[PDB]
Amino acid sequence: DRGVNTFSPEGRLFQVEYAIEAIKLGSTAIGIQTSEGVCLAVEKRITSPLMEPSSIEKIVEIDAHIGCAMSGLIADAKTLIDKARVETQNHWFTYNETMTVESVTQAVSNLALQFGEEDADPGAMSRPFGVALLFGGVDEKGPQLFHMDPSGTFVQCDARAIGSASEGAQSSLQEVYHKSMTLKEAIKSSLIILKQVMEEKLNATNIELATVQPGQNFHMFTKEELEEVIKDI
Amino acid sequence: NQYDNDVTVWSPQGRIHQIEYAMEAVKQGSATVGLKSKTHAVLVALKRAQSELAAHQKKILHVDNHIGISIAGLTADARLLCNFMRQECLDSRFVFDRPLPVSRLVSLIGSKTQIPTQRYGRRPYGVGLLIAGYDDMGPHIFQTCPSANYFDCRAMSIGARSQSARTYLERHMSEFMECNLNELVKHGLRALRETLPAEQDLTTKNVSIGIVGKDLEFTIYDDDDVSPFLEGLE
Amino acid sequence: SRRYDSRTTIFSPEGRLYQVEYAMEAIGHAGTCLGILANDGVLLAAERRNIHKLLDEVFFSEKIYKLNEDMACSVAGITSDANVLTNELRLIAQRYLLQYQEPIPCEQLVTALCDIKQAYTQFGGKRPFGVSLLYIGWDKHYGFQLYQSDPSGNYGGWKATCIGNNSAAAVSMLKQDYKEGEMTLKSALALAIKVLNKTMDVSKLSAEKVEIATLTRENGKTVIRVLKQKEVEQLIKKHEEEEAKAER
Amino acid sequence: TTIMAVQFDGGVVLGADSRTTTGSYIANRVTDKLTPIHDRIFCCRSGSAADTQAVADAVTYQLGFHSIELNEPPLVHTAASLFKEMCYRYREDLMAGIIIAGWDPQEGGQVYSVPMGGMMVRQSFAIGGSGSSYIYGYVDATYREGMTKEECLQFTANALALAMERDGSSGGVIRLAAIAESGVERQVLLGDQIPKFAVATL
Amino acid sequence: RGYSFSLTTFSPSGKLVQIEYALAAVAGGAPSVGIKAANGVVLATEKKQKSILYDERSVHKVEPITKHIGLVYSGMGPDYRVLVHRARKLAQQYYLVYQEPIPTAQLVQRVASVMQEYTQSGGVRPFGVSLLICGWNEGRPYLFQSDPSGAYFAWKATAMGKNYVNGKTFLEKRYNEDLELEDAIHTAILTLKESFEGQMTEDNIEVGICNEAGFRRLTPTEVKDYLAAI
Amino acid sequence: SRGSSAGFDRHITIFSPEGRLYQVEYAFKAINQGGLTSVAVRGKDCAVIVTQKKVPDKLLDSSTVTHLFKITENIGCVMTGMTADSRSQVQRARYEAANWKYKYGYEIPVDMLCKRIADISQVYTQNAEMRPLGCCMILIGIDEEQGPQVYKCDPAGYYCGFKATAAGVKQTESTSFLEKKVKKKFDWTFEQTVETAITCLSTVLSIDFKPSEIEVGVVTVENPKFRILTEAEIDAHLVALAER
Amino acid sequence: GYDLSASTFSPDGRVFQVEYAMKAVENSSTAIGIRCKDGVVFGVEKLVLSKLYEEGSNKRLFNVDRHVGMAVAGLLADARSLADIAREEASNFRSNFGYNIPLKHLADRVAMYVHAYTLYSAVRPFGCSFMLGSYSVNDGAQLYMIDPSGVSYGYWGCAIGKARQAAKTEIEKLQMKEMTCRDIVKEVAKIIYIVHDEVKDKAFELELSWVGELTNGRHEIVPKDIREEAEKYAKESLK
Amino acid sequence: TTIAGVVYKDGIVLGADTRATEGMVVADKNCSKIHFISPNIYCCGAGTAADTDMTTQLISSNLELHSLSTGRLPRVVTANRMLKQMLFRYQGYIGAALVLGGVDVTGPHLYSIYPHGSTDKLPYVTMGSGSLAAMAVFEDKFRPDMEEEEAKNLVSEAIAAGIFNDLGSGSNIDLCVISKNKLDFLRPYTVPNKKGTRLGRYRCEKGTTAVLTEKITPLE
Ligand SMILES: *[C@@](O)([C@H](CC(C)C)NC(=O)[C@H](CO)NC(=O)CCCCC(C)C)[C@@](C)(O)CO
Ligand SMILES: *[C@@](O)([C@H](CC(C)C)NC(=O)[C@H](CO)NC(=O)CCCCC(C)C)[C@@](C)(O)CO
Ligand SMILES: [Cl-]
Ligand SMILES: [Cl-]
Numbered sequence A: 001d002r003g004v005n006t007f008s009p010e011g012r013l014f015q016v017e018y019a020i021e022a023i024k025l026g027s028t029a030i031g032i033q034t035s036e037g038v039c040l041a042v043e044k045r046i047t048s049p050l051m052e053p054s055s056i057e058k059i060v061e062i063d064a065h066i067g068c069a070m071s072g073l074i075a076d077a078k079t080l081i082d083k084a085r086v087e088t089q090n091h092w093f094t095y096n097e098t099m100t101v102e103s104v105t106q107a108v109s110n111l112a113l114q115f116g117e118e119d120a121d122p123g124a125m126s127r128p129f130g131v132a133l134l135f136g137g138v139d140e141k142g143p144q145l146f147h148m149d150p151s152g153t154f155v156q157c158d159a160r161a162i163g164s165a166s167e168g169a170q171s172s173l174q175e176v177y178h179k180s181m182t183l184k185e186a187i188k189s190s191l192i193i194l195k196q197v198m199e200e201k202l203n204a205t206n207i208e209l210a211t212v213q214p215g216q217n218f219h220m221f222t223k224e225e226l227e228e229v230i231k232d233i
Numbered sequence B: 001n002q003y004d005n006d007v008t009v010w011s012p013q014g015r016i017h018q019i020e021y022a023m024e025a026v027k028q029g030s031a032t033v034g035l036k037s038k039t040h041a042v043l044v045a046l047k048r049a050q051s052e053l054a055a056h057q058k059k060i061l062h063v064d065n066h067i068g069i070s071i072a073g074l075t076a077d078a079r080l081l082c083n084f085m086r087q088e089c090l091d092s093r094f095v096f097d098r099p100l101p102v103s104r105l106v107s108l109i110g111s112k113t114q115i116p117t118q119r120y121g122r123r124p125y126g127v128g129l130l131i132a133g134y135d136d137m138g139p140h141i142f143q144t145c146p147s148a149n150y151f152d153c154r155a156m157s158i159g160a161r162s163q164s165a166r167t168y169l170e171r172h173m174s175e176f177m178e179c180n181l182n183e184l185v186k187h188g189l190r191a192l193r194e195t196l197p198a199e200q201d202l203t204t205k206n207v208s209i210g211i212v213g214k215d216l217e218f219t220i221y222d223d224d225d226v227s228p229f230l231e232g233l234e
Numbered sequence C: 001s002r003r004y005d006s007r008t009t010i011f012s013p014e015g016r017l018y019q020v021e022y023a024m025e026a027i028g029h030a031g032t033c034l035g036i037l038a039n040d041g042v043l044l045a046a047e048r049r050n051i052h053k054l055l056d057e058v059f060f061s062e063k064i065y066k067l068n069e070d071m072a073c074s075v076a077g078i079t080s081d082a083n084v085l086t087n088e089l090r091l092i093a094q095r096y097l098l099q100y101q102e103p104i105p106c107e108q109l110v111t112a113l114c115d116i117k118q119a120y121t122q123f124g125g126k127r128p129f130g131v132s133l134l135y136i137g138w139d140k141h142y143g144f145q146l147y148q149s150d151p152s153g154n155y156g157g158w159k160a161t162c163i164g165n166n167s168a169a170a171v172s173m174l175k176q177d178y179k180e181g182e183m184t185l186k187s188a189l190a191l192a193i194k195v196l197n198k199t200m201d202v203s204k205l206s207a208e209k210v211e212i213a214t215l216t217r218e219n220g221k222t223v224i225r226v227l228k229q230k231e232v233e234q235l236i237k238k239h240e241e242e243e244a245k246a247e248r
Numbered sequence D: 001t002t003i004m005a006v007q008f009d010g011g012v013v014l015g016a017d018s019r020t021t022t023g024s025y026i027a028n029r030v031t032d033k034l035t036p037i038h039d040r041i042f043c044c045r046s047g048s049a050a051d052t053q054a055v056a057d058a059v060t061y062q063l064g065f066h067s068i069e070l071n072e073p074p075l076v077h078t079a080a081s082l083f084k085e086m087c088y089r090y091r092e093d094l095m096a097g098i099i100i101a102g103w104d105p106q107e108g109g110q111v112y113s114v115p116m117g118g119m120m121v122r123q124s125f126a127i128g129g130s131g132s133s134y135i136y137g138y139v140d141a142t143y144r145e146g147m148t149k150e151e152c153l154q155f156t157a158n159a160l161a162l163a164m165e166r167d168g169s170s171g172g173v174i175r176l177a178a179i180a181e182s183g184v185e186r187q188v189l190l191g192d193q194i195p196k197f198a199v200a201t202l
Numbered sequence E: 001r002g003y004s005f006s007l008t009t010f011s012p013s014g015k016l017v018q019i020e021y022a023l024a025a026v027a028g029g030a031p032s033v034g035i036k037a038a039n040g041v042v043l044a045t046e047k048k049q050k051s052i053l054y055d056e057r058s059v060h061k062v063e064p065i066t067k068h069i070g071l072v073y074s075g076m077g078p079d080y081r082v083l084v085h086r087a088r089k090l091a092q093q094y095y096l097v098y099q100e101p102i103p104t105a106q107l108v109q110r111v112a113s114v115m116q117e118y119t120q121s122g123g124v125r126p127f128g129v130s131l132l133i134c135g136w137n138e139g140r141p142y143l144f145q146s147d148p149s150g151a152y153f154a155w156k157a158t159a160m161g162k163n164y165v166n167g168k169t170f171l172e173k174r175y176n177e178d179l180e181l182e183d184a185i186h187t188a189i190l191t192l193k194e195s196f197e198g199q200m201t202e203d204n205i206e207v208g209i210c211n212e213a214g215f216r217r218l219t220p221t222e223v224k225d226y227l228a229a230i
Numbered sequence F: 001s002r003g004s005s006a007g008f009d010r011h012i013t014i015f016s017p018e019g020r021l022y023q024v025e026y027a028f029k030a031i032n033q034g035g036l037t038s039v040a041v042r043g044k045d046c047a048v049i050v051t052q053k054k055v056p057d058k059l060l061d062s063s064t065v066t067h068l069f070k071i072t073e074n075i076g077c078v079m080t081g082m083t084a085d086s087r088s089q090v091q092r093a094r095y096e097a098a099n100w101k102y103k104y105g106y107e108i109p110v111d112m113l114c115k116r117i118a119d120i121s122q123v124y125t126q127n128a129e130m131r132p133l134g135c136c137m138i139l140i141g142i143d144e145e146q147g148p149q150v151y152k153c154d155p156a157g158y159y160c161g162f163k164a165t166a167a168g169v170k171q172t173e174s175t176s177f178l179e180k181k182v183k184k185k186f187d188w189t190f191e192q193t194v195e196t197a198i199t200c201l202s203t204v205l206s207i208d209f210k211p212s213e214i215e216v217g218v219v220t221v222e223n224p225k226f227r228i229l230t231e232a233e234i235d236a237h238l239v240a241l242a243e244r
Numbered sequence G: 001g002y003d004l005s006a007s008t009f010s011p012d013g014r015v016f017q018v019e020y021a022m023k024a025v026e027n028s029s030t031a032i033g034i035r036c037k038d039g040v041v042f043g044v045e046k047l048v049l050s051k052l053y054e055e056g057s058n059k060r061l062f063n064v065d066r067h068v069g070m071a072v073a074g075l076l077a078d079a080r081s082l083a084d085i086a087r088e089e090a091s092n093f094r095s096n097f098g099y100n101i102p103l104k105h106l107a108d109r110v111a112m113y114v115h116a117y118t119l120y121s122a123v124r125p126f127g128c129s130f131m132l133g134s135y136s137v138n139d140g141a142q143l144y145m146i147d148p149s150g151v152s153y154g155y156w157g158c159a160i161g162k163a164r165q166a167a168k169t170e171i172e173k174l175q176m177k178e179m180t181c182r183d184i185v186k187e188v189a190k191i192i193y194i195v196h197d198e199v200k201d202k203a204f205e206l207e208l209s210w211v212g213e214l215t216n217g218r219h220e221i222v223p224k225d226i227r228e229e230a231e232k233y234a235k236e237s238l239k
Numbered sequence H: 001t002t003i004a005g006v007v008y009k010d011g012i013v014l015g016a017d018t019r020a021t022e023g024m025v026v027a028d029k030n031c032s033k034i035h036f037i038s039p040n041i042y043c044c045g046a047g048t049a050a051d052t053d054m055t056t057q058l059i060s061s062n063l064e065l066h067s068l069s070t071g072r073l074p075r076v077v078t079a080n081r082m083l084k085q086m087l088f089r090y091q092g093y094i095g096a097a098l099v100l101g102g103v104d105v106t107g108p109h110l111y112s113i114y115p116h117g118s119t120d121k122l123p124y125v126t127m128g129s130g131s132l133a134a135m136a137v138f139e140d141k142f143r144p145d146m147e148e149e150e151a152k153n154l155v156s157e158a159i160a161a162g163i164f165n166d167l168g169s170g171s172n173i174d175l176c177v178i179s180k181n182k183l184d185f186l187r188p189y190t191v192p193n194k195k196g197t198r199l200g201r202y203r204c205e206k207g208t209t210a211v212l213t214e215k216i217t218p219l220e
């Protein structure tokens, strides 16, 4: 046993490396950025038919122009999501404008290494967050997808998978992605990939899907709209 | 071993293993190069992309009109330190209505980063910086380390395979002071290119450039804007 | 400093709290202490450990504490820890009376102290208190009452119970002799002496070695009394007369 | 109150009246307003009795500790600086007009004024307290560069006597102190020993 | 900062071993004796006093807390000085509120409560001392012991420190209820002589007494007088 | 028992099974790391402190090598053991004395100053996060009723007043020498105090000193201010001794 | 193990964490100070670990007050932190007492700050030793040295770092009490060249500073031309 | 209130009247104004009654802690410092005006202490609304080195001057005499004022007062 802010001989924080390994215990999520908008798709991972599938929420609205998909220790994601929401509302309050996707991601990412046991307040964070996040949205730069992990590193991606089967899924994403791909193609591609990687047979209740487009606000697909897209796939 | 988990534990050889380990975070970052002439200070950085579909991590950051940085190591530590630098610069303009001299800012970094190396349960900063600036004493390149030491440089490279870049920079450094801007940036790029596997080359996707000088506020060049500098590596 | 911290407030691999379990081993070795509820009152009877010839006798009891007008308790375990908790019980009871201008109901006093004990198992990195308590009382909501609490911050209400040395044996004897709904103070007293006579099996029972307190209601007021030694010897006599009847 | 100090070659002379008042009642007619701060450093106190006593006690403590730490006699300038720091910092809560005077081996006899508000200035001679108003003219006309110790003592006693005659708020006895390398010599002028100047009758 | 975790914890068998080990520091300390007579209390102690070089008068083991309460100990002297200082402060705090000298039993309870703290509070060890506290109030003498756990007990007579087990049996076969203070002083000194080793003088024992007139140390000359018979 | 150990009882100030504090014991060994011995003796008229002065290096400014310190004008001390710890303890003593005078209007008695420093040292033996100071303080001064005083406190927080005492490497041997000498003396009191101190130190070390190899400090009833002897003053004592 | 915390004595009464910090100073290249008739002169063997560094980088000589120089060996970030402590102490002294801090008092105050880092598991000892030098007409020339334990003494001559003993033996050959600062700079340069191990560490810069009658009691870098002459004298004397 | 003190050849005499007032009404006819500090030090109090009581009690208590520690008899300077430093800290809001006298190892000492924290060390002092009457007596009649009985006469004369000429002062004269050898706490010293006698009797027989309700509660 050693402290939570101990470096390994390779120059990494043990706690952060271990938090990154926790992301691999999460369900798979996929993000794709097209010129017509971004989509976010996630495997629900239902463990009993008695569980209400609509109570699993692994895609959330941050603001009208920004959604977020998560994988890893989901309970950990709540304070990050709430910080994202509060930050975009503060930015609106102060500046009377929408906050960029990049800026939201940056604000959240500055929480990442704020843990430790002898600088801070009486019961501050004891460990990093075991969560990875995909922020998908539209701002004056156009559609945008950003990835963030427990190191506080964030980066724009054209397409990205996270969670258990992300290797796999990332490989299929390289194969199918192209810069001029339509949103409807991106939606189909991500369901085709989820279908391959999921242990369960894909259907309209054990996945979630959302989009954000230049025309249109954050939109969660309904059961009926998922069924339509599932027919071809 | 019993000596390597706490920044407060000296080893029997007079070393602090936690500081040495923090320095490995910088040696494993992607390479960056800094150099200067009589009139300009330049930063050149290789950006690592996770997959073929990722953007490439930012390596060069604006601090003030007269100061920019290039980073290697933990990105979150780089942002924390960059925010400290920005704030110190803003304070100096607010109070004195003039730019913070570059050497004074670097001193402030040394003093700030030393503190957690001496207190139980704290850790060093796991980031190394190249700092380009221009003030009344002309252009500067400084380097900062997780040990809280810093160095005033004619030119420098840090990160993975930076030994090759340093060897190029030593070989050509007698030319730098008299270089025009284009010549100086070309030298930065050739140094950085020495860090690459033989197959691979500098492209508009993987190179980022920062420049400041007498007539030029700190400016970052990325993507299509680096093309002028890459063409004519002839 | 991480090397020296024994980590008193963490879980073990089976979901256990070792310091709590170990404190419970301390309690098992302390003086036996029982409580018995009757129709017309409640009692506490405790083994005394302060029994050397040269001791002076200065207080009205060794291990029975008055908490407020309507409640008392007894303790098994670390004595200095008991003095801290019983002081805190008295404070809680006066804070309530200040605020509401009525006595604290018994279960509410017990629960308030149990929340303090619970906190010591969950945060702060301190050793828990090494004390179990029996509480007797009357309030206007449930009348005569008996409670037990332990170092986990757990409690329960009982018609009869025992803590400290030979608890398990004492409880078996109570299970067999206690008449739900039909006990009087006089028969609860007889049963208490029967039980202590069997569980102080090192060795022969004497008034110098036990302490008994009764809680009753008289003319709209609660009376808490520690029996004098004369009365205790009389009850021991009656129990010994009674065992002479046991065969023919 | 009237207080005064004067520099000579090798030392200083300090002087004060001895009256403490509340309104126009005399609460002490033989007050000692010249308080030792170290072996060869005194202060003359005017304004609030409570304030100047508290401040003098605190400076005595600070200067004593400082002196033991350095293993040397303290500078007169150091004593004045400590007064000044406290009188300036707490200027809104104190009513204190102080003269610091003494001798040290480095700069000899020195007089410093710390008036209300907490400025500090070195002077050849200094006067303070409410009675000082009535002797500005006298001291300005009578002061001469290069006075001996004995002349400084007379100059001081005369100035104080004149102030004490005119200022209802000053009076009693004159306390004097001379400080030099050889030590401190204190004395009291009382009754017939106080310098005398006629009332100008017709 | 301070360590915020307890240094005393429960062992698997339910023991607080740091407290047991604090008691072993007490057991190895110099002997102390207290005897409650009918009309007063005597406290007596041996000095662990080597050299003739010691100024025996320069520090005391038998100390006044108030006009009417006094203390002695066995175990670690510097720990004792902490408790003496806190006891004196506790007594004055009581007096300021109630305008009555603190009852002996009230003072013992408050001091014992401080000792308990040091068995649980962060980053500290328990006190390596047991206290014997005497007093007179409500027309009557009191003798108490307070141990490193914060447990306290009222005694007619007792012994602590080196060879205490024997000292207790010596007193058991020697104390009676109706004994006077002057006789009690004699038996207290005899109790120390049981385990002395050295030849007793008035300079290497210390005696304190408590009666209706108050608590005080006996003087070297008074102790010399009692030593002539012994 | 007999040197037994459990848990962290050799690393921090918790009790060993025998009731010992090993970390406090080890602070006493630290006093001897310095390799020096000090002696102090009181008579009816004065009290004296003598200590070794070792200047091995020629490049040292030997006027800055001292173990004698003025605490107040009237209280002197000799420090033995770890040097930086000693200096810190001297600063604290100076602070405590000055604060006493400010609050109470009279000079701190030597016994009270020694007690206060001892009480401060006690805290380091009961709290786990800091070590004891590996030094020992001997204080001298004149008490208006009791005359010359010698007091000593140690890293365990023990303290006592003495007719004479010692500290450091040859403490035990000094104690025997001083014990044997006082028994001979009428009313068990030292009379030639500076000579006893120097002779004791010279016997237990086997040295026969030059005036630059010792430091001497004194307080007297006639002259209560703490004074440090010069080389020439010390030399007069060394020569007067050599000649009988 | 007995060597992990500055709050733990070993069984022989040592504080190994302080000893380990001393080993960091003893791995460092050598700094010397010499007091003479009319001032103090400092010299440092400054190892140049890369030709890419500017002349002047990683100074080991500091001004801590206008009249006080500081020369360091050991972990350089620790030394700079101490220089800042020394500067704050000098500044605070001037604000509170109204005159320039005497050298001895400054040495003692900083030494007590160093000492405070040798008592606790919460912090570690400083890995540096440093010299403080000043001159004034009233106090004369003064040279103090402070080590990681917080011990502080005054010196005629002093050396810290890895060739400390070799430096001291050369310093002992000078009659420094009768020499001037202008004479001593040449001898400081000479001694640095003597103790420099030209096989094992390849390249160094000589750093020189002084404070004395000739600088009017201000601590200053030795001027460039005088430094170059001293180097030239040292090099030719090596021969 | 009239309080006063004098230094005489071998000690201190303190004096006080015994009236306490609320507005212009007598609340206490026999208030004790000479307060214990230590066995060798006493203190008269004037001003706000709760403040004089509490201030002297606190200092007495801290001084007992001091003497317990030192093992020595306390000094008058120490009481003076403790009082003045506390009063200064409270900026005159603690309305205690004190005459402090005692005898220590350095002999007799007398101080007046004011609410704002100034003190004056003098051979005679007075305080309270009667203080100018009492001071007139002292200025007219004090001599240095008086004998015990002369000093006692003078102090009681001075208190009497305040009693008879100040509406704030009245009732009895208390004295405290402190020397190296003796402490005489003389309460009362003189009783120069006496209530006149009652001329008619108003002994109202049972049933004179009409009663609406009655409850007897027996006790043990
Ligand atoms: C002096 O300035 C004199 C100097 C002082 C240090 C003794 N000041 C006073 O007498 C002052 C009023 O100016 N008086 C006090 O502080 C009151 C002290 C006692 C208060 C109670 C009696 C209420 C002159 C010129 O002001 C003296 O008149
Ligand atoms: C006294 O100064 C007298 C002294 C006091 C210690 C008894 N002061 C008072 O009586 C003051 C004057 O306002 N009164 C009170 O503090 C109100 C409390 C009195 C009621 C009793 C409960 C004590 C003289 C001169 O002021 C008396 O007139
Ligand atoms: Cl992933
Ligand atoms: Cl990097």
Ligand SMILES: [Cl-]
Pocket: A151, A153, B073, B074, B075, B076
């Ligand atoms: Cl990173």
Ligand SMILES: [Cl-]
Pocket: B145, B147, B149
């Ligand atoms: Cl480095």
Ligand SMILES: [Cl-]
Pocket: B026, B027, B157, B158, B159, B160, B162
């Ligand atoms: Cl690198």
Ligand SMILES: [Cl-]
Pocket: C068, C069, C070, C097
């Ligand atoms: Cl109640």
Ligand SMILES: [Cl-]
Pocket: C068, C069, C070, C093, C097, C102, C103, C104
């Ligand atoms: Cl109640």
Ligand SMILES: [Cl-]
Pocket: D031, D032, D033, D049, D053
């Ligand atoms: Cl005054």
Ligand SMILES: [Cl-]
Pocket: D096, D097, D098, D114, D115, D116, D128, D129
């Ligand atoms: Cl003014």
Ligand SMILES: [Cl-]
Pocket: D046, D096, D097, D098, D115, D116, D127, D128, D129
């Ligand atoms: Cl003025």
Ligand SMILES: [Cl-]
Pocket: D001, D046, D047, D129, D130, D131
């Ligand atoms: Cl004025």
Ligand SMILES: [Cl-]
Pocket: D018, D019, D020, D026, D028, D029, D030, D170, D171, D172, D173
């Ligand atoms: Cl007057």
Ligand SMILES: [Cl-]
Pocket: C001, E002, E003, E004, E005
């Ligand atoms: Cl902790």
Ligand SMILES: [Cl-]
Pocket: E084, E085, E088, H068, H069
């Ligand atoms: Cl005490």
Ligand SMILES: [Cl-]
Pocket: E066, E067, E091, E092, E095, E100, E101, E102
């Ligand atoms: Cl009391």
Ligand SMILES: [Cl-]
Pocket: E064, E215, E216, E217
């Ligand atoms: Cl006593």
Ligand SMILES: [Cl-]
Pocket: D057, D060, D061, D064, F098, F101, F102
């Ligand atoms: Cl003072």
Ligand SMILES: [Cl-]
Pocket: F185, F189, F190, F191, F192, F193, F196
């Ligand atoms: Cl002798």
